[PDB]
Design a protein around this ligand. Structure first.
Ligand SMILES: CC(=O)SCCNC(=O)CCNC(=O)[C@H](O)C(C)(C)COP(=O)(O)OP(=O)(O)OC[C@H]1O[C@@H](n2cnc3c(N)ncnc32)[C@H](O)[C@@H]1OP(=O)(O)O
Ligand SMILES: CC(=O)SCCNC(=O)CCNC(=O)[C@H](O)C(C)(C)COP(=O)(O)OP(=O)(O)OC[C@H]1O[C@@H](n2cnc3c(N)ncnc32)[C@H](O)[C@@H]1OP(=O)(O)O
Lengths: 139, 139
């Protein structure tokens, strides 16, 4: 099992993996989200490869004050093997390697399995409200 | 009134301002936060100057997927002038200019004023839980 940075050749496999992980949302064009990362900085956008195939990903990121993580997914047939953990742990190390002091992640207030996963990894709930404003609309 | 990017010469004036705005937190070394931004990309770290002095700031950011904003502060004697609004607006334009599709901001749960400011500026609530994990501690 090997964790590495996303490459242009992984483009379609990654999207298909997102489809299978139910990570796609109508308001976020996945082609656009990948192109944004490619143009901005691909280095924290990781994939997990097992026997040559991409079976997991995490779109990590850093803005100069806090790290982030979106599109965390592991293919259904490859779950319960510690891949998401491996992914998150590698991101955290890449983040620390460049001076990132903290990582923040937003999770659906509904998903308990994911909430639990983050808690076991040492993440704690922040007493804040998350607000947002769309700047460029996707289709 | 002029909004522009943070300059090294602004360092002590900004920290002093942050103290005056009660933005400092023990777990965040302000000097360290400024250096992180300088090393990563200073371009979205904006200051507002009036009559030659820095009277407002916003530490904007972009990670390749979402925009962010920290350290939003306006000197107490310069409030109710639209300075905070102008800082956020300019940050939004800079975000859009580089392709950022959306900005997110977490607000303390009980800060009614700030929550109201953002809603009034067109930011909507996300039904999500913010989780965080400290990666490098500041002393
Ligand atoms: C940034 C984000 O979080 S985006 C939102 C993430 N949500 C999704 O991606 C939804 C789709 N789901 C998935 O892709 C996968 O189920 C993931 C990413 C949630 C989990 O991936 P996996 O590789 O199975 O995780 P991994 O094997 O590292 O498991 C991590 C923990 O979750 C636990 N876990 C995995 N599946 C389940 C389950 N069905 N029920 C309860 N716990 C589970 C594991 O037991 C493990 O905990 P442990 O360390 O205490 O054993
Ligand atoms: C990333 C972050 O958010 S960091 C956390 C932010 N919070 C803090 O910094 C706490 C310290 N507070 C401050 O420094 C200032 O009070 C700020 C930055 C919140 C606001 O500064 P100001 O320059 O006064 O805000 P500005 O004048 O642009 O007002 C923005 C909008 O919110 C409303 N608002 C803000 N404060 C008030 C107030 N005391 N009374 C009425 N309306 C207010 C304004 O009415 C305005 O809309 P308007 O067009 O109706 O006037």
């Amino acid at each position: 099992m090997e964790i590495r940075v996303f490459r242009q050749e992984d483009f379609e496999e990654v999207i298909t993996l997102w489809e299978r992980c139910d990570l796609l949302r109508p308001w976020n064009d996945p082609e656009m989200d990948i192109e944004r990362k490619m143009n901005h900085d691909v280095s924290l956008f990781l994939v997990a490869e097992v026997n040559g195939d991409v079976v997991g990903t995490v779109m990590g990121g850093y803005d100069g004050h806090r790290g982030s993580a979106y599109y965390l997914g592991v293919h259904p047939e490859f779950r319960g093997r510690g891949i998401a953990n491996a992914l998150l742990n590698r991101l955290e190390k890449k983040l620390i390697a460049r001076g990132c002091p903290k990582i923040q992640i937003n999770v659906p207030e509904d998903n308990d399995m994911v909430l639990g996963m983050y808690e076991r990894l040492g993440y704690e709930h922040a007493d804040v409200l998350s607000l947002g404003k769309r700047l460029i609309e996707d289709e």
